[PDB]
Design a protein around this nucleic acid. Sequence first.
RNA 1: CUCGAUGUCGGCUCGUCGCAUCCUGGGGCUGGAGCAGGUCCCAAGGGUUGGGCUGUUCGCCCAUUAAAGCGGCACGCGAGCUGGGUUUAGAACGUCGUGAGACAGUUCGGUCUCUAUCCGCCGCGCGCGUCAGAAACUUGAGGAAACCUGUCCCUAGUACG
RNA 2: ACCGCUGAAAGCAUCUAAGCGGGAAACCUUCUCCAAGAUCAGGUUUCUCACCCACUUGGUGGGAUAAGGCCCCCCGCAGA
Lengths: 174, 60, 37, 213, 146
Amino acid sequence: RIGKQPIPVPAGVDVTIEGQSISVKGPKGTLGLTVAEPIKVARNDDGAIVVTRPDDERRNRSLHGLSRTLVSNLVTGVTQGYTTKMEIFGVGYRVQLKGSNLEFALGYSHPVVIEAPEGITFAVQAPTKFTVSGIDKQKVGQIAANIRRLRRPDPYKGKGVRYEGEQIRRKVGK
Amino acid sequence: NAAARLNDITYNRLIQGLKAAGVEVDRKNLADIAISDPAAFTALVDVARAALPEDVNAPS
Amino acid sequence: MKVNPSVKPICDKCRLIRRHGRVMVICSDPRHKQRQG
Amino acid sequence: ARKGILGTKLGMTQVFDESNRVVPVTVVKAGPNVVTRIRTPERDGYSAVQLAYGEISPRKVNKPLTGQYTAAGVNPRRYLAELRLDDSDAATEYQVGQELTAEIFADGSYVDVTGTSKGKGFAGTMKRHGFRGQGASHGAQAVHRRPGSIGGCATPARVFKGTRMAGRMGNDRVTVLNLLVHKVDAENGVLLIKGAVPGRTGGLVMVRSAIKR
Amino acid sequence: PTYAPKAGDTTRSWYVIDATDVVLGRLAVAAANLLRGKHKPTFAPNVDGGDFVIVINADKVAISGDKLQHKMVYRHSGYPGGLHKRTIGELMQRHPDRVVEKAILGMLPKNRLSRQIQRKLRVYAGPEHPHSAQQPVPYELKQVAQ
RNA sequence: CUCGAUGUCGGCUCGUCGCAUCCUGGGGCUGGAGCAGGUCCCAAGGGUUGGGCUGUUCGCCCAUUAAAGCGGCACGCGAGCUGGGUUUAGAACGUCGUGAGACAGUUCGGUCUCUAUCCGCCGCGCGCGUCAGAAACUUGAGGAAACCUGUCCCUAGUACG
RNA sequence: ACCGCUGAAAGCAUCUAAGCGGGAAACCUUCUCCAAGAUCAGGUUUCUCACCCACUUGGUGGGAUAAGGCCCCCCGCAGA
Ligand SMILES: [Mg+2]
Ligand SMILES: [Mg+2]
Ligand SMILES: [Mg+2]
Ligand SMILES: [Mg+2]
Ligand SMILES: [Mg+2]
Ligand SMILES: [Mg+2]
Ligand SMILES: [Mg+2]
Ligand SMILES: [Mg+2]
Ligand SMILES: [Mg+2]
Ligand SMILES: [Mg+2]
Ligand SMILES: [Mg+2]
Ligand SMILES: [Mg+2]
Ligand SMILES: [Mg+2]
Ligand SMILES: [Mg+2]
Ligand SMILES: [Mg+2]
Ligand SMILES: [Mg+2]
Ligand SMILES: [Mg+2]
Ligand SMILES: [Mg+2]
Ligand SMILES: [Mg+2]
Ligand SMILES: [Mg+2]
Ligand SMILES: [Mg+2]
Ligand SMILES: [Mg+2]
Ligand SMILES: [Mg+2]
Ligand SMILES: [Mg+2]
Ligand SMILES: [Mg+2]
Ligand SMILES: [Mg+2]
Ligand SMILES: [Zn+2]
């Protein structure tokens, strides 16, 4: 049922489909994507984005759901970006920023510095709460996972970084 | 076969064509005239094409 | 990760999937994580 | 910007550092070099600079080689060898005919020295490859320095390529890496490289900056 | 007496084969046939018939991704353990013309004459070849309908 | 297959290969708090000790080590070595046999030939080729070699307990 | 190996089906050495770049040479 439903667009002054490619823009920065060749993209009566496929094939059903979710990701990333709330646990572990860069004092003999690439921004709300924001959903999730894996899983004290509200498994320990 | 596919026919079907057309010229002389008289070879290809059945692929 | 030619779900939340040409079971319990080989 | 100089091994000696520690040094007269040619990526396909070293009488050089020297506009030299550089910013500093000399290297820098190791003649397997040889006694019959077995049996019915056997040692191009430059004296064009340098006393050596640092 | 070509009866032309979307095997068969001279009725297996073949755009020969990842080129130096493995995928990056030429050479008969045959083959990664002094006619791959 | 002969064990010397990995390297799970481990997965680049006993292989032991891996290659390798064992002829013991003698029973002694033709390999030349003849300097297709590891100090007696 | 991001088929979910990452003494570069007999016999240069005779006048033979080299000689820490 993913795919057979239009793409809502709040403003989309320049959501364009040129030569089997989509490019979305607006009040925030640009995004672009290429869609696989069986899938077409067109308008609705209100000017939305619809994805269509040749009917009832194993490969094209998967591609069609893929394309619908991807274009949904672009058209939401422009309107309002993805912000992953990450959060540190473990006494003595903390975050801080140096411009676009930040470092963690997460138990090593050195600070760990993550230099922010393009399109993604870093921000602490606390020396425990931090945030990776951006306009590409895949890139944001990838950088957030890069942060998430800095510390090995600790099921005994939970020392390390997390995503907010997501709780890791524990064990009794000693 | 080389001469036949210069005249856009496989040796496969040229041999049928000559059989059906009733041409009993053997491959000694077919090859030798493919070299010496290519225009005559093209004529033989034409008669072989004509003798071929319209749908060379359907059962007889 | 248990590497055996016979992999089957252990508990009710063992999803048994097939990734990269090989079948395996992934579950919330990592002790149940288990791969065909 | 890898730097290099063509010189002669003048033999070794010892000196003493400021720490009162003995330091075995091979002294290399990095006699002045002239360039005579720049190798460029768009005309030769790679970046290098020829260096000419060593006084030779002009009558001793054949006219095909004197023509190259005179097209370079320099007096004919005895040795000529290229220093290979990286692929960009190649000849922003080397000009044909510039006179590059020992103090291109600095005190305490690290160099790679290339030479032709000393000839050893036709060498046996112990001397050439460090084979253990066989026992001097306990019945050993005339195999005291002989290689021993050189292959398997019916499988494979052959001896593998690269089997270490007797043959000529030495006269090999050899590079020793990360030799300290104890001292370069500009007064007379000699650098005092700590350690051993391949080849004859008197042999041609190329001293380059150590890329391993 | 069946015709046997003389020395001097062999007239050689020059073809350019664009490899931009051709399956590598199709390209190799066509090049081998054309460069041997199987297509001309004057063919003799003991004669260097056949024309000159320039393959261009060897970088974009059609090789499926599975072959680009898994098909391996094997080279034994003759030293023990001297088997060196490369992948079609990385020879495409380094020496794609070598991939095309290796395919041709495998199609060619394994004999002395083929050593002279393969001398008439030029393979180029880019869209340009230096052999414009001739007038190398383009040659497309065709299949005779049956 | 070999009886108009394919030299048998162990050692030495030289290796080379597989990975079913002993160490070093990377990981998953743990009845993984930490230190150590257990197990499984990936990984063959390198390394993988010296002695005592025994002909030994094996094995046990000593002292180490990061580790003291397992296998193949005619149980690799005697036109490379040894010749201690086995497996000729001497002799003795036990045992069997009336005896001559015999014994995967023991004991002492007892052998190691060949000037390399071909392939192969290690080196070194001569010739020719390389679209005129030469000289110098070179590119690098493609190869070869090489690839080990410990302890201590700081981090920090901190994390963990 | 393993750990992922985005993500459907399968409204969820899932490292995978499209796609994108991290990842080891293994592999390829990088270090060292050999290397154009690499017969695809390479490149940059520099030097000579010149004649004479005869025939069946020929990418012809010779002769003479050039650049260059070899042999001879004095040797070498180069070496059978
Ligand atoms: Mg089971
Ligand atoms: Mg994978
Ligand atoms: Mg000597
Ligand atoms: Mg020894
Ligand atoms: Mg000895
Ligand atoms: Mg003797
Ligand atoms: Mg002796
Ligand atoms: Mg016999
Ligand atoms: Mg394994
Ligand atoms: Mg483990
Ligand atoms: Mg090993
Ligand atoms: Mg390696
Ligand atoms: Mg003793
Ligand atoms: Mg072994
Ligand atoms: Mg044996
Ligand atoms: Mg053995
Ligand atoms: Mg033996
Ligand atoms: Mg033998
Ligand atoms: Mg009795
Ligand atoms: Mg007996
Ligand atoms: Mg005895
Ligand atoms: Mg001998
Ligand atoms: Mg190379
Ligand atoms: Mg070769
Ligand atoms: Mg070289
Ligand atoms: Mg050359
Ligand atoms: Zn489970």
